[PDB]
């Protein structure tokens, strides 16, 4: 009776479906797959990437950056929503091949440094290559690259290091306030009395209110379905996108229903 | 045409076949599986573990340590042959549950710190949970635990951090010199002109001579077949075990044959 | 005109004045100096150390542990108030010589990992030897060693990783609730509009309320004067010690006065 | 009788004497101080810095890079001779302010990661802010930036991670082979029977032969006096510079004399 074999982290086929860059605003492009968000922001002094997707998406991200006229050495900074394998997957490889720096808060930094292993809820099941954070950022800290200011908003819950990123772009000269908010889901998490996260419920609740108050004209999420984006349809991709209030309210109704079933 | 799914590191069934502790010498026990070596050394001041096997072997190692009357908090030190997933697999988990320290040279430390990712030859294919080395040891340095002195002998090749560990035990009061030598194989490695390892051939050759000169009355290897051990047969397990000279000579004949075919 | 020389972190003479172990409760001893707290908790399964003081206090701590009959290999765990040089100074050296593990939250972990350098307020002026955290702990998480449960309470402010530690001891069989609360001072900090800490004032205020609600029969602080301890007088050391309310209220009155002068 | 105060690492005044960039070859400039080498290599794709000097030299290095028309974000890579405080001092700060990556071997990486603390010979006496290596390089590995190839040559001794860097530049179109060799000194080291470095003498001897065989038309050293440079005299700075043979032979005669006095 041999011990079990290791099990690969395997996701939906659409999470790994490459797509050509889809323009969000004047400087902002979606360059990930159909169902995983990877945002490229092009400035006069370099490029900023927010999330990278799965581990095996590293080559596709660089191919899309080339299509945008962004050489590898032009990627200055990597920002993250949270350091799970399906959002921070290729960060280690991207650092080696681009010379970019990574900016994260302490919680995302320690999780990223151990490649997602020893997860509070998933154990060692979703491990990925580790990377180091070069800059630690605090709640409300501004990160400026090429004139574009990125403000971090901590929203703990899905991970302790979960972070929303806001910045103002333009739509043909007219300013548009973009908010890239992290996941508000708890897929199979023990919510009440979790010895690895004793104040988990207080963090989620406080984060629901955080997402509501975000300065937002256009919302995006790591999983585009969470905010009702549809990257595959091109132009009408943002047609049915939720507001910040709708997104945090829908997430909280699922949180409470899950919290109530957990007591049952 | 979606990008490929991740692939799990899957090994032979016998590498994951648990076995009861097999006594090597008065203080030395094999507590791994049939085809993967994990050596436990019991002293008056604590226990020393050399290698741990696969990632999923952590529970079995602790079960065997209990059978030997070794509580988790009695494991003082973890030593490694090399930091590949099939030898350093459970080190991270074992540190959390035992309070042990890990001693390795700088090369094994940096590879262990990134969980085997970015391997010189295997890329990110054999990743495992990362761990940190608490003590860096130099070539020829002695590590003493409970009166038992462990001398490290660097033998780079299979990995840059590959290490042989020697110590003197007893066999009913009569001293027996044990040498635990690391792998001398190069499974699918590019040997000549490897941009990630330009002096690889000089390291292997120098390591063949290193293994020959080791003070050794009884030889063990991470893979027991390399030194012709057979853990499954219990008593006669060491019956056909190779000497140090036989082991390094057989490995070098395979190295040269492989080096010659590589030029062809 | 040569560039300036490096400047050593030099403290009051009394911060470096060794003292013999002073008993706080049945299992709890002060083993630091007259003006720097280092708490030793002796259990049936090992010892716990809370804070270590200055970098150069490592030998004195081990000398005092011996006086208590605690060998180096009996130190199981190191807990911290915050990772400044005058409280986490000897942690790196203590890990090497005792085999202890270190438990801290993510913020204290990242600061401890870079030896206090790049401090939010002090720059590189108070650097000390770096150490790694072996276990990351969350707010409200319980750490049990030898039956004694240690609960962490995050109180950000003096550092982002600032932590209060509570545990129940006994005083000749009668239980006594001990709270070791971290510093609530801001010596020379920019409080309002700090680009390295935009929500600093919200953290301090929330931490003042945290210290008030702590389950506490006897309060201790990293600097004993903050809670009106006097380690030098032996028996009457805790005679004039403040309550939790008195300590947080005195700290907040100094915070507000400082905040008001900062606007002036 | 209080414990001693901490002691600052204080060096000769000339080690901290700023100077204007001194041209070595077409692409290579000395931008450090009079007695500490910091080499800037300007390419079409960015800049390479070899060594940085003391911790407090970070601002001066950036001032000199500006004089050369090199903005902070143009610094692509930092290479090191060895990770002592007087050569790797400002590396941490330079990474934060330039976005450069650092390339070092495993030994220099682990020492740099702990800020020079726990030195094999100097203990914690010469600590500096820690930094992380982004790329691990092997002996003989080539690092190419902007067409300029940098080959590493390991020369252990002064530190285990000591490294010589060679590259071909031009002198008005005519190629000039530059070798930047690390220190070959052992100031106060225990040479024979050093428990922290049992094979120290074998490393130095092998390194003396390594420095002799280096492809070199013009030699430089971290301390310019070691190779008889005189940065202060401008034009005639390289007038009396030693060859590689003269440098390794003079170092070995001092090594043997020191080794012989150590036995006395
Ligand atoms: C780790 O990545 C997530 N989970 C998974 O991939 C798998 C899971 O947990 O099921 C999983 C976990 C552990 C394994 O060993 C294997 C698989 C996660 O973080 O929860 C990902 N991330 C998010 C998020 O970020 O919100 C959602 C959104 S919910 C959703 N998305 N599609 N359907 N649903 C209901 C869940 O999937
Ligand atoms: C990483 O672990 C080893 N390789 C493997 O497990 C697999 C491989 O390389 O084939 C592998 C590699 C990458 C993958 O993505 C998937 C699988 C390795 O380090 O080479 C292991 N370790 C040793 C050693 O330590 O010598 C031998 C001994 S040779 C031997 N053993 N049995 N048959 N043979 C001929 C090879 O297997
Ligand atoms: C870093 O350590 C503290 N500061 C200092 O040692 C020095 C300082 O800041 O002045 C300092 C700072 C930077 C330097 O380059 C040199 C020196 C600190 O963390 O603030 C220490 N810790 C606490 C605390 O933990 O609360 C108090 C309590 S206030 C107090 N204590 N005595 N008198 N006062 C008014 C201040 O001292
Ligand atoms: C750490 O930096 C070096 N040593 C020192 O700065 C001091 C020392 O050791 O004396 C020292 C050490 C520890 C302390 O707590 C305080 C000071 C070193 O690495 O040896 C530096 N580096 C080199 C080198 O790199 O070769 C030489 C060249 S020999 C030379 N240079 N000038 N005169 N001499 C004879 C020595 O100085
Ligand atoms: Zn997730
Ligand atoms: Zn996800
Ligand atoms: Zn291997
Ligand atoms: Zn193997
Ligand atoms: Zn402090
Ligand atoms: Zn303090
Ligand atoms: Zn040096
Ligand atoms: Zn030096």
CSV table of C-alpha atoms in Angstrom, one decimal, chain A residues 23-263:
chain,number,residue,atom,x,y,z
A,23,UNK,CA,-7.7,47.6,-24.2
A,24,UNK,CA,-9.3,48.7,-20.9
A,25,UNK,CA,-8.3,52.4,-21.0
A,26,UNK,CA,-5.7,54.6,-22.7
A,27,UNK,CA,-2.8,53.1,-20.8
A,28,UNK,CA,-4.3,49.8,-19.5
A,29,UNK,CA,-4.5,46.5,-21.3
A,30,UNK,CA,-5.7,43.0,-20.4
A,31,UNK,CA,-3.0,40.6,-21.6
A,32,UNK,CA,-3.9,37.4,-19.7
A,33,UNK,CA,-6.2,34.6,-20.6
A,34,UNK,CA,-10.0,34.6,-21.1
A,35,UNK,CA,-10.7,33.8,-17.4
A,36,UNK,CA,-7.6,35.1,-15.6
A,37,UNK,CA,-6.7,38.8,-15.4
A,38,UNK,CA,-3.2,40.2,-16.0
A,39,UNK,CA,-3.2,43.9,-16.4
A,40,UNK,CA,-0.5,45.8,-18.2
A,41,UNK,CA,-0.1,49.6,-17.7
A,42,UNK,CA,2.1,51.4,-20.2
A,43,UNK,CA,3.8,54.7,-19.0
A,44,UNK,CA,6.4,57.0,-20.4
A,45,UNK,CA,9.0,55.5,-18.0
A,46,UNK,CA,8.1,51.8,-18.2
A,47,UNK,CA,5.4,49.2,-17.8
A,48,UNK,CA,3.5,48.0,-14.7
A,49,UNK,CA,2.0,44.5,-14.5
A,50,UNK,CA,-0.7,43.7,-12.1
A,51,UNK,CA,-1.0,39.9,-11.5
A,52,UNK,CA,0.4,37.3,-13.9
A,53,UNK,CA,-2.0,34.4,-13.8
A,54,UNK,CA,-0.9,30.7,-13.7
A,55,UNK,CA,2.7,29.5,-13.5
A,56,UNK,CA,2.7,28.4,-17.2
A,57,UNK,CA,1.5,31.9,-18.5
A,58,UNK,CA,5.0,33.5,-18.4
A,59,UNK,CA,5.7,33.1,-22.1
A,60,UNK,CA,2.3,34.4,-23.2
A,61,UNK,CA,2.6,37.5,-21.0
A,62,UNK,CA,5.9,38.4,-22.6
A,63,UNK,CA,4.5,37.7,-26.1
A,64,UNK,CA,1.7,40.1,-25.4
A,65,UNK,CA,4.0,42.7,-23.9
A,66,UNK,CA,6.0,42.6,-27.2
A,67,UNK,CA,2.8,43.1,-29.2
A,68,UNK,CA,2.3,46.3,-27.1
A,69,UNK,CA,5.9,47.3,-28.0
A,70,UNK,CA,7.2,46.6,-24.4
A,71,UNK,CA,10.5,44.9,-24.3
A,72,UNK,CA,11.3,42.6,-21.3
A,73,UNK,CA,13.7,45.2,-19.8
A,74,UNK,CA,10.9,47.8,-19.9
A,75,UNK,CA,8.8,46.0,-17.2
A,76,UNK,CA,9.6,48.0,-14.1
A,77,UNK,CA,7.2,46.7,-11.5
A,78,UNK,CA,5.0,43.8,-10.6
A,79,UNK,CA,1.9,44.4,-8.4
A,80,UNK,CA,-0.3,41.6,-7.0
A,81,UNK,CA,-3.8,41.0,-5.9
A,82,UNK,CA,-3.0,38.0,-3.8
A,83,UNK,CA,-0.2,35.4,-3.9
A,84,UNK,CA,-2.1,32.3,-4.9
A,85,UNK,CA,-0.7,30.1,-7.7
A,86,UNK,CA,-3.4,31.3,-10.2
A,87,UNK,CA,-2.5,35.0,-9.8
A,88,UNK,CA,1.2,35.0,-8.8
A,89,UNK,CA,2.2,31.9,-10.8
A,90,UNK,CA,4.8,33.3,-13.2
A,91,UNK,CA,6.2,36.0,-10.9
A,92,UNK,CA,9.4,34.2,-10.2
A,93,UNK,CA,10.1,33.5,-13.9
A,94,UNK,CA,9.0,37.0,-14.9
A,95,UNK,CA,11.5,38.6,-12.5
A,96,UNK,CA,14.4,36.5,-14.0
A,97,UNK,CA,13.6,37.4,-17.6
A,98,UNK,CA,12.5,41.1,-17.2
A,99,UNK,CA,14.5,42.7,-14.4
A,100,UNK,CA,11.3,43.9,-12.8
A,101,UNK,CA,10.8,44.6,-9.1
A,102,UNK,CA,7.9,43.3,-7.1
A,103,UNK,CA,5.9,45.4,-4.6
A,104,UNK,CA,3.7,43.7,-2.0
A,105,UNK,CA,2.6,44.0,1.6
A,106,UNK,CA,4.2,41.9,4.3
A,107,UNK,CA,1.6,39.2,4.2
A,108,UNK,CA,1.7,38.7,0.4
A,109,UNK,CA,5.5,38.9,0.7
A,110,UNK,CA,5.8,36.0,3.2
A,111,UNK,CA,3.3,33.9,1.2
A,112,UNK,CA,5.0,34.7,-2.1
A,113,UNK,CA,8.4,33.9,-0.5
A,114,UNK,CA,7.3,30.3,0.3
A,115,UNK,CA,5.6,29.8,-3.1
A,116,UNK,CA,2.1,29.5,-1.7
A,117,UNK,CA,3.0,26.5,0.4
A,118,UNK,CA,1.7,26.1,4.0
A,119,UNK,CA,-1.5,27.9,2.9
A,120,UNK,CA,-3.9,28.8,5.7
A,121,UNK,CA,-6.6,26.8,4.0
A,122,UNK,CA,-5.1,24.8,1.1
A,123,UNK,CA,-2.0,23.4,2.8
A,124,UNK,CA,0.8,22.5,0.3
A,125,UNK,CA,-1.7,21.7,-2.4
A,126,UNK,CA,-1.2,24.7,-4.6
A,127,UNK,CA,2.5,25.3,-4.5
A,128,UNK,CA,4.3,27.4,-7.2
A,129,UNK,CA,7.8,28.7,-7.7
A,130,UNK,CA,8.8,31.2,-4.9
A,131,UNK,CA,9.7,34.8,-5.5
A,132,UNK,CA,10.9,37.6,-3.2
A,133,UNK,CA,9.2,41.0,-2.7
A,134,UNK,CA,11.7,43.8,-3.3
A,135,UNK,CA,9.5,46.6,-1.8
A,136,UNK,CA,7.1,46.3,1.2
A,137,UNK,CA,4.1,48.6,0.9
A,138,UNK,CA,1.7,49.7,3.6
A,139,UNK,CA,-2.0,50.3,3.5
A,140,UNK,CA,-2.8,53.4,1.6
A,141,UNK,CA,0.8,53.8,0.2
A,142,UNK,CA,1.2,55.3,-3.2
A,143,UNK,CA,3.4,53.7,-5.9
A,144,UNK,CA,4.2,56.1,-8.8
A,145,UNK,CA,5.6,54.8,-12.1
A,146,UNK,CA,5.8,57.2,-15.1
A,147,UNK,CA,3.4,59.7,-13.5
A,148,UNK,CA,0.7,57.0,-12.9
A,149,UNK,CA,0.1,56.7,-9.1
A,150,UNK,CA,-1.0,53.4,-7.7
A,151,UNK,CA,-2.7,53.4,-4.3
A,152,UNK,CA,-2.9,50.1,-2.3
A,153,UNK,CA,-6.0,49.3,-0.2
A,154,UNK,CA,-5.7,46.3,2.1
A,155,UNK,CA,-8.7,44.0,2.0
A,156,UNK,CA,-7.8,40.9,4.0
A,157,UNK,CA,-9.9,37.8,3.7
A,158,UNK,CA,-9.3,35.6,0.7
A,159,UNK,CA,-5.7,35.9,1.8
A,160,UNK,CA,-4.3,37.9,4.7
A,161,UNK,CA,-2.3,39.9,2.1
A,162,UNK,CA,-5.2,40.6,-0.3
A,163,UNK,CA,-4.9,44.0,-1.9
A,164,UNK,CA,-7.0,46.3,-4.1
A,165,UNK,CA,-5.2,48.7,-6.4
A,166,UNK,CA,-6.6,51.9,-7.7
A,167,UNK,CA,-5.4,54.4,-10.3
A,168,UNK,CA,-6.7,57.1,-12.6
A,169,UNK,CA,-6.3,56.5,-16.3
A,170,UNK,CA,-7.9,58.3,-19.3
A,171,UNK,CA,-10.4,57.4,-22.0
A,172,UNK,CA,-9.4,59.8,-24.9
A,173,UNK,CA,-8.3,62.5,-22.5
A,174,UNK,CA,-11.3,62.0,-20.1
A,175,UNK,CA,-10.2,60.6,-16.7
A,176,UNK,CA,-11.5,57.2,-15.7
A,177,UNK,CA,-11.0,55.9,-12.1
A,178,UNK,CA,-10.0,52.2,-12.2
A,179,UNK,CA,-10.2,49.9,-9.2
A,180,UNK,CA,-8.7,46.4,-9.4
A,181,UNK,CA,-10.2,44.7,-6.4
A,182,UNK,CA,-9.1,41.3,-5.1
A,183,UNK,CA,-11.2,38.2,-4.5
A,184,UNK,CA,-13.9,38.3,-1.8
A,185,UNK,CA,-14.6,34.5,-1.9
A,186,UNK,CA,-13.9,31.8,0.6
A,187,UNK,CA,-14.0,28.5,-1.4
A,188,UNK,CA,-14.2,25.8,1.3
A,189,UNK,CA,-12.7,27.9,4.0
A,190,UNK,CA,-13.5,27.2,7.6
A,191,UNK,CA,-14.9,30.6,8.6
A,192,UNK,CA,-15.8,30.4,12.3
A,193,UNK,CA,-13.2,29.4,14.9
A,194,UNK,CA,-10.3,28.8,12.4
A,195,UNK,CA,-7.2,28.3,14.5
A,196,UNK,CA,-5.0,29.5,11.6
A,197,UNK,CA,-7.1,32.7,11.2
A,198,UNK,CA,-9.0,33.5,14.4
A,199,UNK,CA,-10.3,36.9,13.2
A,200,UNK,CA,-11.2,35.8,9.7
A,201,UNK,CA,-14.8,37.0,9.8
A,202,UNK,CA,-13.8,40.4,11.1
A,203,UNK,CA,-11.4,40.8,8.2
A,204,UNK,CA,-14.0,39.8,5.5
A,205,UNK,CA,-16.6,42.1,6.9
A,206,UNK,CA,-14.2,45.1,7.2
A,207,UNK,CA,-13.1,44.2,3.6
A,208,UNK,CA,-16.6,44.3,2.2
A,209,UNK,CA,-16.9,47.9,3.4
A,210,UNK,CA,-13.5,48.6,2.0
A,211,UNK,CA,-14.4,47.5,-1.5
A,212,UNK,CA,-17.6,49.6,-1.3
A,213,UNK,CA,-15.8,52.9,-0.6
A,214,UNK,CA,-13.1,52.5,-3.4
A,215,UNK,CA,-12.9,55.4,-5.9
A,216,UNK,CA,-14.1,53.5,-8.9
A,217,UNK,CA,-15.5,54.3,-12.3
A,218,UNK,CA,-14.6,50.9,-13.8
A,219,UNK,CA,-14.0,47.7,-11.7
A,220,UNK,CA,-11.9,44.7,-12.5
A,221,UNK,CA,-11.2,41.5,-10.6
A,222,UNK,CA,-8.6,38.7,-10.8
A,223,UNK,CA,-11.3,36.4,-12.0
A,224,UNK,CA,-13.3,38.4,-14.5
A,225,UNK,CA,-16.6,36.6,-13.8
A,226,UNK,CA,-16.6,37.9,-10.2
A,227,UNK,CA,-17.2,41.4,-11.6
A,228,UNK,CA,-19.1,40.2,-14.7
A,229,UNK,CA,-16.5,40.9,-17.3
A,230,UNK,CA,-16.3,38.8,-20.4
A,231,UNK,CA,-12.9,39.1,-22.0
A,232,UNK,CA,-13.8,36.9,-24.9
A,233,UNK,CA,-16.3,39.2,-26.5
A,234,UNK,CA,-13.8,42.0,-27.1
A,235,UNK,CA,-15.7,45.3,-27.3
A,236,UNK,CA,-18.7,44.5,-25.1
A,237,UNK,CA,-16.4,42.9,-22.5
A,238,UNK,CA,-17.2,45.6,-19.9
A,239,UNK,CA,-20.9,45.9,-20.9
A,240,UNK,CA,-22.3,44.1,-17.8
A,241,UNK,CA,-19.5,44.8,-15.4
A,242,UNK,CA,-20.6,45.3,-11.7
A,243,UNK,CA,-20.0,48.4,-9.7
A,244,UNK,CA,-18.0,48.3,-6.5
A,245,UNK,CA,-21.2,48.3,-4.4
A,246,UNK,CA,-22.8,45.5,-6.4
A,247,UNK,CA,-19.6,43.4,-6.2
A,248,UNK,CA,-19.0,43.7,-2.5
A,249,UNK,CA,-22.8,43.3,-1.8
A,250,UNK,CA,-23.0,40.1,-3.8
A,251,UNK,CA,-19.9,38.7,-2.2
A,252,UNK,CA,-21.2,39.5,1.3
A,253,UNK,CA,-24.5,37.8,0.7
A,254,UNK,CA,-22.6,34.7,-0.3
A,255,UNK,CA,-20.3,35.0,2.7
A,256,UNK,CA,-23.3,35.2,5.2
A,257,UNK,CA,-25.1,32.3,3.5
A,258,UNK,CA,-21.9,30.3,3.7
A,259,UNK,CA,-21.3,31.4,7.3
A,260,UNK,CA,-24.9,30.3,8.2
A,261,UNK,CA,-24.6,26.9,6.5
A,262,UNK,CA,-21.3,26.3,8.4
A,263,UNK,CA,-23.1,26.5,11.7
